[PDB]
Structures are given as C-alpha cells and as structure tokens.
Design a protein around this motif. Structure first.
Motif, PDB file in Angstrom:
ATOM      1  N   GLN A   7      37.527  -2.917  58.742  1.00  0.00           N
ATOM      2  CA  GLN A   7      38.144  -3.818  57.795  1.00  0.00           C
ATOM      3  C   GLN A   7      38.591  -3.076  56.569  1.00  0.00           C
ATOM      4  O   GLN A   7      37.764  -2.439  55.913  1.00  0.00           O
ATOM      5  CB  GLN A   7      37.202  -4.961  57.400  1.00  0.00           C
ATOM      6  N   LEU A   8      39.893  -3.198  56.210  1.00  0.00           N
ATOM      7  CA  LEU A   8      40.374  -2.611  54.969  1.00  0.00           C
ATOM      8  C   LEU A   8      39.853  -3.457  53.806  1.00  0.00           C
ATOM      9  O   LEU A   8      40.245  -4.625  53.647  1.00  0.00           O
ATOM     10  CB  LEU A   8      41.905  -2.474  54.936  1.00  0.00           C
ATOM     11  N   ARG A   9      38.889  -2.896  53.069  1.00  0.00           N
ATOM     12  CA  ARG A   9      38.269  -3.560  51.935  1.00  0.00           C
ATOM     13  C   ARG A   9      39.214  -3.536  50.736  1.00  0.00           C
ATOM     14  O   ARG A   9      39.397  -4.575  50.110  1.00  0.00           O
ATOM     15  CB  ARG A   9      36.915  -2.918  51.590  1.00  0.00           C
ATOM     16  N   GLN A  19      43.195  -3.107  44.721  1.00  0.00           N
ATOM     17  CA  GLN A  19      43.697  -4.309  45.386  1.00  0.00           C
ATOM     18  C   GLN A  19      42.731  -4.792  46.485  1.00  0.00           C
ATOM     19  O   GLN A  19      42.610  -4.148  47.527  1.00  0.00           O
ATOM     20  CB  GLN A  19      45.104  -4.062  45.964  1.00  0.00           C
ATOM     21  N   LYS A  20      42.015  -5.917  46.218  1.00  0.00           N
ATOM     22  CA  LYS A  20      41.093  -6.549  47.173  1.00  0.00           C
ATOM     23  C   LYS A  20      41.858  -7.042  48.413  1.00  0.00           C
ATOM     24  O   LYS A  20      42.849  -7.762  48.275  1.00  0.00           O
ATOM     25  CB  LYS A  20      40.343  -7.728  46.517  1.00  0.00           C
ATOM     26  N   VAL A  21      41.424  -6.595  49.612  1.00  0.00           N
ATOM     27  CA  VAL A  21      42.010  -6.943  50.920  1.00  0.00           C
ATOM     28  C   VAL A  21      40.913  -7.551  51.832  1.00  0.00           C
ATOM     29  O   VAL A  21      39.782  -7.053  51.834  1.00  0.00           O
ATOM     30  CB  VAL A  21      42.674  -5.718  51.602  1.00  0.00           C
ATOM     31  N   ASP A  22      41.240  -8.608  52.608  1.00  0.00           N
ATOM     32  CA  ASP A  22      40.247  -9.253  53.487  1.00  0.00           C
ATOM     33  C   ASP A  22      40.812  -9.520  54.871  1.00  0.00           C
ATOM     34  O   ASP A  22      40.075  -9.522  55.860  1.00  0.00           O
ATOM     35  CB  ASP A  22      39.749 -10.585  52.863  1.00  0.00           C
ATOM     36  N   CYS A  37      46.362  -8.695  61.065  1.00  0.00           N
ATOM     37  CA  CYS A  37      46.430  -9.448  59.816  1.00  0.00           C
ATOM     38  C   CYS A  37      45.960 -10.839  60.073  1.00  0.00           C
ATOM     39  O   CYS A  37      46.535 -11.537  60.898  1.00  0.00           O
ATOM     40  CB  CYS A  37      47.839  -9.442  59.246  1.00  0.00           C
ATOM     41  N   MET A  38      44.905 -11.248  59.392  1.00  0.00           N
ATOM     42  CA  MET A  38      44.280 -12.543  59.629  1.00  0.00           C
ATOM     43  C   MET A  38      44.972 -13.675  58.916  1.00  0.00           C
ATOM     44  O   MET A  38      45.976 -13.493  58.221  1.00  0.00           O
ATOM     45  CB  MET A  38      42.792 -12.520  59.231  1.00  0.00           C
TER      46      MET A  38
END
Length: 121
Positions: A7-9, A19-22, A37-38
């Motif tokens: 997971q790219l944090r 930059q926050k990524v989820d 990409c969710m």
C-alpha cells in the motif's frame, strides 16, 4: 523479498511536502507487476506490467509497452486520465526508481527526489 501487495502510504516531494494516499496499491510477483486504485464503492481499477531489478533500481514497465505492434493500445492507455492521475509516468509508460528501503513491512522508492513510501498489506 518483493512478492505481495504494497500500500502506498504517502508521497514525499523534494521541498518537503507530504501527500496522504490510501487508495493506491502495488503488486509484485516473479517479474510481473500489478497496481490498483480503490473506491470505498466496492470496485477498483487495475494496471499491469513487468519489473526488472538492476543494482539498486527497479524498472517498472506497463503492459502494453510501446513496441510497433502495441503502439495503438499503448497510446490508448498512456493518454487515459486514470493513468495520468495514478502513474503520471508520461508517454513511455515506464519509470525507474531508486530502491532506498525494502524490508518485510516497509518499501521506499525514489524518483527525482520524490519518495514513494509503501507499507506491505
């Protein structure tokens, strides 16, 4: 030591920005690459390719590549908004990263100063 979903944090831009990524995940399996990409919806968009390990670098290439027989499908991919928003790797559909960190839990890639900070899922 690359196998599994990552997971790219976050993104860490040179000058300091975080930059926050989820929604983003990278997958690695015996030369093959996967990316998704969710959407809290219950659906996700996916990408695939291959990677090559050289010294302290990983070269991720998305399929279809830009060979003579693939150019039409390659251009349909690298011009899609989904690719521009998710990868942004340009017309080539390829990006080479410096592997700064790779453990059983964390992974940190580097591209022209931008750090890609992943956690194993």
């Amino acid at each position: 030591d690359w196998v599994g979903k990552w997971q790219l944090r976050e993104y860490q831009y040179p000058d300091g920005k975080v930059q926050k990524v989820d929604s983003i995940f990278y997958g690695f399996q015996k030369g093959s690459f996967l990316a998704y990409c969710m959407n809290k919806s219950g659906s996700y968009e996916g990408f695939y390719g291959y990677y090559k390990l050289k010294d302290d670098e990983i070269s991720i290439t998305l399929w279809p590549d830009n060979s003579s027989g693939n150019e039409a499908a390659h251009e349909e991919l690298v011009n899609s908004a989904s690719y521009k928003n998710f990868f942004g790797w340009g017309d080539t559909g390829e990006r080479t990263f410096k592997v700064e960190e790779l453990t059983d839990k964390k992974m940190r890639l580097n591209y022209e100063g931008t750090k890609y900070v992943f956690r194993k899922y």
